[PDB]
Ligand binder design. Structure first.
Ligand SMILES: [Zn+2]
Length: 179
């Protein structure tokens, strides 16, 4: 049940949540408990000609604050007021303390580019990640529940058992944890 912890705008991360982190090959940090499942996920893809990379894993509070601030600045640079920019940014970037990147269980996956395209890696993960305990966290048809826009790059570890049941039923994490 530890891998089924929900962190949303409706469910802030507890400040008691300390994560045992290990450093990936690219310097990014993840929870040590998802490490072999993540390694298996990438070995699987590379066997099918898909070459994925971890663009973002664990993030400190200030790190999320930096990402939010730059996103806000983008909207302000395009005629949005402070309030409008922040409101528009919160739909893409999570408020510092509501991001599951602070859990260390979430990874932003991109293509390496030189072997696979962005489309190829995202579609392979869409139909294979569940077998290794990872789910496409923010579906385009579940944006009203997750409160987050379409992010085909964001994947969250929930465990093989949960991910399989989530994928087969076509639900998101919020719906799955709903009785
Ligand atoms: Zn993400």
């Amino acid at each position: 049940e530890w891998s089924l912890i929900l962190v949303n705008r409706q469910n802030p991360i507890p400040a008691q949540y300390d994560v045992e982190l290990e450093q990936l090959s690219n310097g990014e940090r993840i929870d040590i408990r998802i490490s072999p499942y993540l390694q298996d996920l990438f070995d699987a893809a590379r066997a099918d000609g898909v070459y994925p990379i971890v663009a973002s894993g664990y993030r400190t509070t200030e790190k999320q604050q930096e990402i939010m601030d730059e996103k806000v600045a983008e909207y302000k640079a395009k005629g949005y007021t402070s309030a409008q920019a922040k409101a528009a940014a919160e739909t893409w970037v999570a408020v510092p303390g509501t991001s599951e990147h602070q859990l260390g269980l979430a990874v932003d996956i991109n293509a390496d580019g030189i072997h696979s395209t962005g489309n190829e890696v995202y579609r392979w993960l869409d139909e294979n990640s569940y077998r290794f305990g990872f789910i496409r966290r923010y579906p385009p048809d579940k944006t009203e529940i997750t409160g987050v826009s379409n992010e085909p790059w964001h994947y969250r570890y929930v465990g093989i058992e949960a991910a399989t049941k989530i994928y087969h039923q076509g639900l998101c994490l919020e719906e799955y944890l709903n009785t």
